[PDB]
Amino acid sequence: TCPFYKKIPGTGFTVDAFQYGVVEGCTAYFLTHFHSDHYAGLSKHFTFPVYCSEITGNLLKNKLHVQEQYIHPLPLDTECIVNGVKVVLLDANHCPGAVMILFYLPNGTVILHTGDFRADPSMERSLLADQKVHMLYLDTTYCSPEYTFPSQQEVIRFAINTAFEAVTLNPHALVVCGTYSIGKEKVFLAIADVLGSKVGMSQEKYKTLQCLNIPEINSLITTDMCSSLVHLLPMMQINFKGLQSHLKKCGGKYNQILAFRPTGWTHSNKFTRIADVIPQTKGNISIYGIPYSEHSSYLEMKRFVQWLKPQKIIPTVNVGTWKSRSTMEKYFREWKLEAGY
Ligand code: NI
Incomplete structure (x- = not known):
């Protein structure tokens, strides 16, 4: 079944959730980037709206043969309305066409989904600087100080x-x-x-x-x-x-x-x-x-999160073992105690 960490609460949206068939209640499927663990499931027979960057859309059309009428490319750094909800796509500093997604929920909650990213100080001067973020869905690939x-x-x-x-x-x-x-x-x-x-x-x-x-x-x-x-x-x-x-x-x-x-x-x-x-x-x-x-290296990830000061973090990588989950939660607590949020 679709994991909780691919669902955006208070919306009809999923992120990188194409391998679970028809997800009940999903009105729009977002795709952060064209890597196979994330696009797995898409093909020429997909008939729900897919929201993504221009580059990701080019790859969907030409490599996977997704029909053009279901591909909804969005410009970066621009406020857009999707099924009644304001969203922004931000450069993720991952591979070409890779994005982070900001969701502005109708009730006032603001959610950032990083997709896959390499955190950089240049992100501290995007549209992220303009409002508080309540929940962070975080690429935790290298969340350990040895990295x-x-x-x-x-x-x-x-x-x-x-x-x-x-x-x-x-x-x-x-x-x-x-x-x-x-x-x-x-x-x-x-x-x-x-x-x-x-x-x-x-x-x-x-x-x-x-x-x-x-x-x-x-x-x-x-x-x-x-x-x-x-x-x-x-x-x-x-x-x-x-x-x-x-x-x-x-x-x-x-x-x-x-x-x-x-x-x-x-x-x-x-x-x-x-x-x-x-x-x-x-x-x-x-x-x-x-x-x-x-x-992100461990230190790049740490700096980004201590700058953003989210109320809740939801890891999206290394979630399959109790030891990994416990380890990441200990680091997030350390980071919050040091920074004072
Ligand atoms: Ni990736």
């Missing part, structure tokens, strides 16, 4: 510098980046830009990127793999077997692979700095795991 990671800027500097050094030393090296969903596009785009190359990819991935409103995208991506020295492959294929096989297919154009896997967090974060990261190597193949996150 530190660097800024996105520091991780990109590392990737650019590593790729540029490798290809300048060996002009016959190929760079490969893994992907399995939208998000983390800066990794492969920034490397291609430093090397003066387009990024080569499958037709399916090219289609996906053409839906994202990225400026000058025709200038950065291509389906002509032969003309490119940065290739995108499925994340599954970023291992020694899969990369050896890919190198065979390039027909002696290249003699080395430098590959990147842009994972969220991996335990080496606890004891290491970004400057100190090293690859796994076998023969003429090296693989770097880089901690590029599109979710």
